[PDB]
Amino acid sequence: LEVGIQAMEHLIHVLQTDRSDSEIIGYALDTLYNIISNSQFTEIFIKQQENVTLLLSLLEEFDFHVRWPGVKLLTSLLKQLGPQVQQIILVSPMGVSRLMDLLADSREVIRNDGVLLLQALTRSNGAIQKIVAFENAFERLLDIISEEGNSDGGIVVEDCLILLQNLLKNNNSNQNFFKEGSYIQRMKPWFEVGWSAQKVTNLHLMLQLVRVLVSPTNPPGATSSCQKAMFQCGLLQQLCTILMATGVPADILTETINTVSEVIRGCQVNQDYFASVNAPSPPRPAIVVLLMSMVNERQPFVLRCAVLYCFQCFLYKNQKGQGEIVSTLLPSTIDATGNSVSAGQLLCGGLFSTDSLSNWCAAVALAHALQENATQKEQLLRVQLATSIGNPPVSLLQQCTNILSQGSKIQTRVGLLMLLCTWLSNCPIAVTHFLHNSANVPFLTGQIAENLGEEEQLVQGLCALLLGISIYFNDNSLESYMKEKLKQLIEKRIGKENFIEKLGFISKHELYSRASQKPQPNFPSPEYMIFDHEFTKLVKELEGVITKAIY
């Protein structure tokens, strides 16, 4: 029957008139919850709005047998028609304050279902999120988490973490209020290293909450000040202890690295601290343990991505650390014990490995050590590589260009071309060192000019970008390949219009867009590790001007 509505408008009638009899109120709310919970009936219950304001009134009743079904009914209304029921409540005076009192209930069957009610209340509603926080939610919910033994708690801490993230996710006002209120420091005891499926669950939501506060997506000063607070109160420090601790699930580990990544990104004090962390062995620097895993083929792909990202994060806006990395490739000392390995050595081993995952990673990692740093771009020009037991040395730059014409897989050459483009970009001297080897320009011209399917379109485009950078950042000091001669080479060998189209293959690649959204390595599987976030910005920055400059 459609008329399950008839015997409901009549339970509402009990709730209006019979309120001195709590046993009948309890029964009617319980029966109404039954009908609405399993919607059609929910839309009808709310259409008479003063029904919702009656429920609100009924929830001030301390009687267990009234307040409990009340809670569960209002949650059910909220889950089903969230925006509308949230509106009726916001527009009703003391509406949200009152619902907060349920979190103060001392019967814990009611405060627990209370938390689940507030989740449904705050979901996707900014203003309500703000009022909940004005009503002391942050302290109350942090208190209940402490009391329940933190990450060792049950579905109860899971539920307070979900609610805390409703309040903080996409809500700058409330992130600021959380910081301003000194609540960050209460996030630290969360992080003392057993391990049930629930503990894993709780701790994963805790790390996402740390990540929310320091997300690259935030106003920049909001992330800065949380990053500083997280240092000041020992929370970064505590996260790092999880990194080198024994017997922590692999997924907790991956996500603790991603978190630290964002807690240090672009913060000198935090990056200085991160690099200063050693593991137990001979002892290993944190940079070195990152780079070792990144280049290790037996480590899971998800983990390699997380250590790449920690490493970029370390280097981000960090010219001190960029130099520290690059100087490693210009060795100054002998270590008498054959023991220690350095950043430079691990990266050089990665560049020329047979694993293309390693090639790509090492090459992006290197580009990150060069970005917006002309000093280091120039230093990297001095790197010499050993060849055979009789032959002369080859430079790093030239060896990287050399792999492009080997039968190498595209993933290794996109990696290498992103390095080469970044390396020559805004560095007239590296352009000269590149254009000084006569094998190079004829190579790029040749790769760009020959019609080669659709798979090799990406590599062709990157070569165009490189050749184009050779022209744009050319200071005309090499008489063998000057600006105007290079343009006439394109015209004669390739055709300028044809050249600018191959250059366009980059921006148009199906994966380019996504790469360009956020800094974190997003790849679903190893085959998708193609573009690096920061490279997408250099394309966007240069594509236009390089086209303009070709005429």
Residue numbers in the entry: 55 to 92, 111 to 265, 271 to 358, 360 to 629
Task: Provide passages from the article that reported this PDB entry.
We used a construct comprising the globular head region of p115 (p115GHR, residues Asp54 to Tyr629) for crystallization. The fragment lacks 53 N-terminal residues that are predicted to be disordered and the C-terminal coiled-coil domain (p115CC). p115GHR consists of a multi-helical β-catenin-like armadillo fold arranged in a regular right-handed superhelix. We observe 10 classical armadillo repeats (ARM1-ARM10) and one non-canonical repeat which we termed USO repeat, after the yeast homolog of p115, Uso1p. ARM1 and ARM2 are connected by a highly acidic and flexible loop (residues 92–110), which is not visible in the electron density. The armadillo repeats exhibit long loops (5 to 13 residues) in ARM5-ARM9. This structural motif of elongated loops culminates in the formation of a short helix inserted in the H2-H3 loop (37 residues) of the terminal USO repeat which we named the USO helix. It folds back into the superhelical groove, leading to a globular C-terminus of p115GHR and covering helices H3 of ARM8-ARM9, while the USO helix points into the center of the groove. In the crystal structure, a dimeric arrangement between p115GHR molecules results from their packing along a dyad axis. The USO helix and the USO repeat helix H2 are part of the dimer interface which covers only 635 Å2 (∼2.6%) of the total 24,000 Å2 of solvent-accessible surface (SAS).
